[PDB]
């Protein structure tokens, strides 16, 4: 299937409490592999997946040097934005940035991204053509003009279409056992009386990877988006994910309901029914 | 690997 590499950066000012807190994390698909925290003692980009620890000292020295430069740039950016928006120096503000690339099943470049948000709202983004900018307002227009004058997009495009994709391929290979695998959901159903005439059927999907999954309840015919509670997919904490869907049904009609599970790790969709 | 060049907004 397709794959992605994404880097997420967050810088938060804290006036009167020192320099802004900077956190960087990197992911390949739904797996985190690196982190940097400006408040930590190590002051190094650190591994968060076993397969990246195989990279040599030059790799780590390089990621650490580069991430420290990102930290200082976004620290300056907080100051610049406070100015562009004529804000006081007393409040805390947030700059977020994300960039990365997607590749298709053939591991060839599919799409690139590079965008920013200020206080949780879109600020500026490189458009899909990787040549033009989408600016949210006058402040962002100032940034856009600055970046056009210094030809930032052309250099970013080269990274997103080349370097980025090359790193993604490298990581997909070195971490092949963990990244190119699929963990099919382990499933089960529970039943609980919620009254003297109704019951709750809950369909579980546990320990699956990647996170993408579809859980649906059907009654004799199809889909039941009525009185069906579906929780947001959540991390189990061990690299896998979980999700459940529940339906409230008239007591005695359990037989009419089936839970359908779709996941890339399953050769064929699962159909589950309540079996006391 | 992250970008090797940085630039201010």
């Amino acid at each position, epitope marked *: 299937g397709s794959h992605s590499m994404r880097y997420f950066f967050t810088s938060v000012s804290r006036p009167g409490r020192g320099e802004p807190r900077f956190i960087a994390v990197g992911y390949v698909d739904d797996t985190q592999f690196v982190r940097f925290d400006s408040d930590a003692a190590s002051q190094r980009m650190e591994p968060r997946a076993p397969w990246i620890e195989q990279e040599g000292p030059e790799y780590w020295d390089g990621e650490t040097r580069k991430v420290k430069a990102h930290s*200082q740039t976004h620290r300056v950016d907080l100051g610049t934005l406070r100015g562009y928006y004529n804000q006081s120096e007393a409040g805390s503000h947030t700059v977020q940035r994300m960039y990365g690339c997607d590749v298709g099943s053939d591991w060839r470049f599919l799409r690139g991204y590079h965008q920013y948000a200020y206080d949780g709202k879109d600020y500026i983004a490189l458009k899909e053509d990787l040549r033009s900018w989408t600016a949210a307002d006058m402040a962002a227009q100032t940034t856009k003009h600055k970046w056009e004058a210094a030809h930032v997009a052309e250099q970013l495009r080269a990274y997103l279409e080349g370097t980025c994709v090359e790193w993604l391929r490298r990581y997909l290979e070195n971490g092949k056992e963990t990244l190119q695998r699929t963990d099919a959901p382990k499933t089960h159903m529970t039943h609980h009386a919620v009254s003297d005439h109704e019951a709750t059927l809950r369909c579980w999907a546990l320990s699956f990877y990647p996170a993408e999954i579809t859980l649906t309840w059907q009654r004799d015919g199809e889909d039941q988006t009525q009185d069906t509670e579906l929780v947001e997919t959540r991390p189990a904490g061990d690299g896998t994910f979980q999700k459940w869907a529940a339906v409230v049904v008239p007591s005695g009609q359990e037989q009419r309901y089936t839970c359908h599970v779709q996941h890339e790790g399953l050769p064929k969709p699962l159909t589950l029914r309540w079996e006391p | 690997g992250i970008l090797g060049f940085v630039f201010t907004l």
Partner: T-cell receptor
Framework: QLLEQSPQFLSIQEGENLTVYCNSSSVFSSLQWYRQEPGEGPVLLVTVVTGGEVKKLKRLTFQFGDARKDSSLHITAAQPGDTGLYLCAGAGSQGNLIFGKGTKLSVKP | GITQSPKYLFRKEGQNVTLSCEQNLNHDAMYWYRQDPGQGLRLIYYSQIVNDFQKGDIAEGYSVSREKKESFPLTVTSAQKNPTAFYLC???????????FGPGTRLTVTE
């Protein structure tokens, strides 16, 4: 990333035309040319960005290859004042400029 | 533009000296190079943004700091038997883009 400049040295008579080359196996997002006199700071002559672009500044003509892997500087009717070290440089992926080793031009009267 | 005062510097071997580089171009990135006679440029150290710096190709024996956007001081310590050279500072609006060079400083260190 590497940038190779040729020829290393060029000596020509005033009035002749000349061409110097800057070549690479890699693609550059932007490229610059400089002229430097001994013991002085290099002077920026031009920046090119678009593949295939041509920029003419007086008697100097600069071209950026379509693939953005090469550039050339051509001078028409060389004057003694053109004597100097010509350097090409390209955008570096680690936040610097990749410099060629230069072409030392001597224009004889 | 870029100022590198003074144009000429003379020091006795074993005496640390700091070369100044100041720019009023409002540039974020700064660079230091050394050049030997009849040769090209060799990158010593650079800084893409205030409060950060990184080594060039020949950083041994040198040190820099970037506490202010407008300045990038180069300290020449007991590098080695070769501190004598022409030193050039340059800046660019953002790192990797076109650089503007200072006039250079000629440093001679004698025994």
């Amino acid at each position: 990333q590497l940038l190779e400049q040729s020829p290393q040295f060029l000596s020509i008579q005033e009035g002749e035309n000349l061409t110097v080359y800057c070549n690479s196996s890699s693609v550059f997002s932007s490229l610059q040319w400089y002229r430097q006199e001994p013991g002085e700071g290099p002077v920026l002559l031009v920046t090119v960005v678009t593949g295939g672009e041509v920029k003419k500044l007086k008697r100097l003509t600069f071209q950026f290859g379509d693939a953005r892997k090469d550039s050339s500087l051509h001078i028409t009717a060389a004057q003694p004042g053109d004597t100097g070290l010509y350097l090409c440089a390209g955008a570096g992926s680690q936040g610097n400029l990749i410099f060629g080793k230069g072409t030392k031009l001597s224009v004889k009267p | 533009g870029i100022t590198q005062s003074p144009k000429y510097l003379f020091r006795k071997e074993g005496q640390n000296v700091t070369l100044s580089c100041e720019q009023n171009l409002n540039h974020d990135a700064m660079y230091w190079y050394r050049q030997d006679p009849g040769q090209g440029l060799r990158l010593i150290y650079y800084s893409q943004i205030v409060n950060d710096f990184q080594k060039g190709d020949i950083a041994e024996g040198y040190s820099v700091s970037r506490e202010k956007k407008e300045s990038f001081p180069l300290t020449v310590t007991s590098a080695q038997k070769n501190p004598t050279a022409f030193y050039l500072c340059a800046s660019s609006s953002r790192s990797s883009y076109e650089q503007y060079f200072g006039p250079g400083t000629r440093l001679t260190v004698t025994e």
